[PDB]
Write a protein that binds this ligand. Structure first.
Ligand code: MN
Length: 690
DNA sequence: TGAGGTAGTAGGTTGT
RNA sequence: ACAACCUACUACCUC
C-alpha cells in the first residue's frame, strides 16, 4: 500500500551526461531536419545551436562555427531547455523505432484497443521532460484517440453525398490540421486549399457522432483507475526496457524514488448554528447561519402549458412547498403581487420578440428574486435563445437575480406524485404538504430542490454556512482570467474572514481591455478588498492569501509595494487545474490502485492535491497542482487552507473540486465574457451567478 | 438550465 | 519551431 506518481527520475545527472554541441553563425530548423533524415539520429536545436547524443557523420554541407563534445552548463536556461528537448526527442525516436508508435497530434499513437461501427479507438501517451535541481524527471500521461475507418472515397463509392460544411481532417504526422480523385476546396482560414479528396476524413468528435455509438464510446474511454495506471506503467516499462541514454531504478514510480513527501489533510467543520461535520448533515435538520426575508416573483409562459400539460396551480404549489421547506430552516419567502397585474403574457410570440417586450417588464420584477419557468426548447434554440437573452437583460441591465427551472424538473416532480396518487387539490393544506415533503425526502430529487433553494438563497443575499475553525490566513483573494476571441474577462473573489463570511464578488469590472490584468486594477482589487475587510471587521488583516488560476503573469513587485503600506504579509500561490499527472495508492495484497481524498505530495514548493472522491463509473480522480511562490508562511499551511476553502460551495450540496476563490472567479469570468452580470456595491453574500 | 464530477474533441496563449 | 498551460463545446455518470 504505497504512493505512486506517474513520473520517473534518472540516476544520472544533467552535468554527468556527454553531448555534442554545434554552433552556427528559426535558424537551424532545416539543418537539423536534414541531418536527422541523413543520419537517422536524434537531434535537437535552439536559436543558433544544435545538440546531439552521438557524433554526426554526413555533415550535409554548411559551416558550423564550433563543434564540441561537452557537458551541460546547468546555470543557463538555454542549455537546460536544449537538453530537455534532446531527451524528449530521443525517447520519441526510441518509441517509434523499437515500438510500433506514431507521432499523431501532440501525443504518441499506440496499438488499437477497440473498434465499434466505423469508429476506431486508439491509445495515446504523452511525455514531458524537466530538469529540477540537477536531476532529470520524466512525466507521462495516457489518453485515447478517435478515428473513422472510412475516408471520403469509400463514402462516395457507396453513393453518399458530402455537404460543403463538413468537418474535414487530414492525417499527416504531427501537423494534423482540420478543415475518384475529386478536387476538394477546404477552407482552413481565408484562402482556400485544394486536395485530391483522399486522406481527408470527417472528424470523430462527440458533436458529430450519432447515437448507439456515443453510449459505447463513452463506456470504453471511461475505464477504472487500476486499468488506467497499469496500462501506462506497462507501456512505460516496455519503453524503458530498450532505452540506453538514461537509467532508472527497478521501480522508479513510487514517490520515495522521486523527491515527494506525503501529507494527509482532514475534513473541516461547517457552522450553521453549531458545529457540523458535513454540509449534507447541516442542510438536513439544521438552521442557517444568516437567514432573512426574501420576496420572490414568478415568471411563466404559455408554451410551458400549451406544449406540456402543466398548469399554474402546479407551479404555485411547488413554490409553496419550497417556501415551507425554507421556513423549516429559518428563512421566509413571500410571493410578489406586481406580477398579478399582467396575466397571459410571455407567449411564444413574446419569445420571438423578447428584445422589444421587456422594457415595460422592469417595474413589476424589481427588488425581487425572479423565478423563471421557461421552456428548454425556447432556452436553447438559436431563434429563441431564451436563457441568454433573459440573463443578459435581467442580470446584465437591471441587476436582478433569477433562477431558471425547465420541464425535466417539473415532470420528474410530477411522476412520483402520480405514482402514489397524490395528484389533487393540495393548496394551503398542512397535512398534504407535510406528506409531500416526506415523500420528497425519500429520493434524489430532494437534492434538486435543495440546489434550487441554495441558488435562491445566494442570489438573495443569504449566507448559508461558514467554517467552524479560522484558517491560518485572515482573508483570501481569488483571480481568474479567460480569453475568448479578442477581448478577455477577469473574475475576482474577496473572501473576507478566516472562516468565510463575505463570499461576495469584487465590486469591480472584469472586462480587461488588454491581453492580461494590468497593475492599475491589481492595486484596486486588494485596496477595496482591505477596505471592505476593515468595514466588516473593524480590524486590519494580518495576512492575505492570493490564489491565481494558472500561472502568475503579473508583477510580484506591485503586491509587495502596495501591501507594505499597511504592513501585511501575503502569498502569490498558483493553482493548476490540469496537472497532466495521476496520483494513486497501490495495494500489494491484491493488485489494485485507489485514491484517497485530501492527499498531498510535496516537493520543494510544488504539491499535488487530491480534492475529490469520484466513483468507478465517473472515472479516476483528477489531481490539482499547487505552486507556492512566496516563502512567508510554512507551505503546509497554504495547502491546508486551499483544501479547507474548497468546502465553501454555498451554491450546491455537491463537493466542488477547486477552492471557492477560483471556482467562482471562473464563473464570474464567464458571466462577464457573455455579459450576464454587472458590478454591485454592498456588504453581504453576493453571488448573482451560480 | 438542480448541481457536481470526468474524458473525448477542437482552438488560443504567452514565452524563449 | 517548441514548451507550458488556459478556454469553449458535446458526452456519458452519480446525487
Ligand atoms: Mn444556479
Amino acid at each position: 500500500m504505497e504512493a505512486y506518481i506517474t513520473e520517473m527520475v534518472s540516476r544520472e545527472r544533467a552535468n554527468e551526461l556527454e553531448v555534442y554541441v554545434y554552433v552556427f553563425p528559426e535558424g537551424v530548423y532545416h539543418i537539423m531536419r536534414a541531418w536527422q533524415r541523413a543520419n537517422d539520429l536524434p537531434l535537437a536545436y535552439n536559436q543558433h545551436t544544435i545538440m546531439a547524443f552521438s557524433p554526426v557523420r554526413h555533415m550535409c554541407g554548411y559551416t558550423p562555427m564550433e563543434t564540441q563534445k561537452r557537458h551541460i552548463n546547468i546555470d543557463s536556461p538555454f542549455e537546460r531547455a536544449l537538453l530537455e528537448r534532446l531527451i524528449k526527442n530521443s525517447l520519441i525516436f526510441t518509441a517509434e523505432r523499437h515500438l510500433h508508435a506514431k507521432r499523431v497530434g501532440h501525443a504518441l499513437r499506440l496499438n488499437q484497443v477497440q473498434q465499434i461501427r466505423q469508429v476506431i479507438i486508439y491509445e495515446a501517451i504523452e511525455l514531458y521532460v524537466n530538469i529540477i535541481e540537477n536531476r532529470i524527471s520524466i512525466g507521462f500521461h495516457l489518453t485515447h484517440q478517435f478515428e473513422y475507418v472510412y475516408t471520403l472515397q469509400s463514402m462516395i463509392e457507396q453513393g453518399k453525398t458530402i455537404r460543403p460544411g463538413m468537418r474535414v481532417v487530414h492525417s499527416n504526422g504531427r501537423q494534423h490540421y482540420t478543415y475518384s480523385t475529386r478536387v476538394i476546396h477546404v477552407r482552413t482560414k481565408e484562402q482556400r486549399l485544394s486536395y485530391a479528396a483522399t486522406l481527408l476524413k470527417p472528424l470523430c468528435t462527440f458533436e458529430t457522432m450519432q447515437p448507439q455509438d456515443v453510449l459505447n464510446v463513452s463506456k470504453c474511454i471511461k475505464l477504472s483507475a487500476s486499468k488506467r495506471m497499469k496500462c501506462t506503467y506497462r507501456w512505460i516499462q516496455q519503453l524503458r526496457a530498450q532505452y540506453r541514454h538514461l537509467t532508472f531504478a527497478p521501480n522508479p514510480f513510487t514517490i520515495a524514488q522521486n523527491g515527494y513527501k506525503l501529507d494527509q489533510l482532514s475534513t473541516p467543520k461547517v457552522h450553521f448554528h453549531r458545529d457540523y461535520a458535513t454540509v449534507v448533515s447541516g442542510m438536513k435538520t439544521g438552521k442557517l447561519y444568516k437567514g432573512g426575508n426574501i420576496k420572490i416573483s414568478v415568471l411563466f409562459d404559455e408554451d410551458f402549458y400549451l406544449k406540456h400539460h402543466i398548469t399554474k396551480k402546479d407551479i404555485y404549489q411547488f413554490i409553496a412547498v419550497l417556501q415551507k421547506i425554507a421556513i423549516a430552516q429559518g428563512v421566509n419567502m413571500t410571493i410578489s403581487t406586481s406580477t398579478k397585474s399582467i396575466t397571459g403574457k410571455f407567449t411564444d410570440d413574446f419569445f420571438h420578440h423578447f428584445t422589444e417586450e421587456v422594457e415595460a417588464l422592469q417595474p413589476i420584477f424589481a427588488q425581487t428574486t425572479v423565478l423563471a419557468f421557461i421552456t428548454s426548447t425556447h432556452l436553447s434554440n438559436k431563434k429563441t435563445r431564451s436563457y441568454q437573452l433573459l440573463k443578459q437583460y435581467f442580470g446584465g441591465k437591471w441587476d436582478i437575480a433569477s433562477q431558471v427551472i425547465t420541464e425535466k424538473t417539473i415532470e420528474a416532480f410530477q411522476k412520483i406524485l402520480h405514482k402514489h396518487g397524490l395528484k389533487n387539490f393540495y393548496p394551503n393544506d398542512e397535512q398534504h404538504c407535510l406528506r409531500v415533503i416526506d415523500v420528497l425526502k425519500n429520493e434524489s430529487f430532494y437534492y434538486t430542490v435543495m440546489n434550487i433553494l441554495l441558488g435562491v438563497y445566494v442570489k438573495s443575499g443569504i449566507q448559508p454556512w461558514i467554517l467552524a475553525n479560522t484558517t491560518h490566513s485572515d482573508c483570501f483573494i481569488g483571480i481568474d482570467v479567460s480569453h475568448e476571441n479578442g477581448n478577455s474577462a477577469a473574475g475576482m473573489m474577496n473572501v473576507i474572514g478566516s472562516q468565510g463570511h463575505l463570499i461576495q464578488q469584487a465590486p469591480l469590472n472584469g472586462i480587461l481591455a488588454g491581453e492580461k490584468i494590468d497593475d492599475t486594477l491589481l492595486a484596486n482589487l486588494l485596496k477595496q478588498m482591505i477596505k471592505a475587510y476593515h468595514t466588516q471587521f473593524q480590524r486590519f488583516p494580518k495576512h492575505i492569501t492570493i490564489h491565481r488560476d494558472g500561472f502568475w503573469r503579473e508583477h510580484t513587485a506591485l503586491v509587495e509595494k502596495i501591501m507594505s503600506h499597511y504592513e501585511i504579509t501575503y502569498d502569490i500561490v498558483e493553482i493548476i487545474k490540469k496537472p497532466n499527472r495521476r496520483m494513486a495508492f497501490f495495494n500489494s495484497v491484491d493488485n489494485t490502485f485507489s485514491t484517497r481524498q485530501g492527499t498531498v505530495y510535496q516537493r520543494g514548493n510544488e504539491a499535488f492535491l487530491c480534492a475529490t472522491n469520484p466513483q468507478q463509473k465517473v472515472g479516476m480522480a483528477q489531481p490539482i497542482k499547487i505552486h507556492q511562490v512566496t516563502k512567508t508562511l510554512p507551505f503546509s499551511h497554504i495547502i491546508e487552507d486551499v483544501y479547507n476553502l474548497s468546502f465553501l460551495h454555498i451554491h450546491a450540496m455537491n463537493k466542488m473540486r477547486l477552492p471557492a476563490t477560483i471556482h467562482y472567479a471562473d464563473l464570474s469570468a464567464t458571466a462577464y465574457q457573455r455579459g450576464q452580470v454587472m458590478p454591485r456595491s454592498g456588504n453581504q453574500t453576493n453571488l448573482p451567478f451560480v
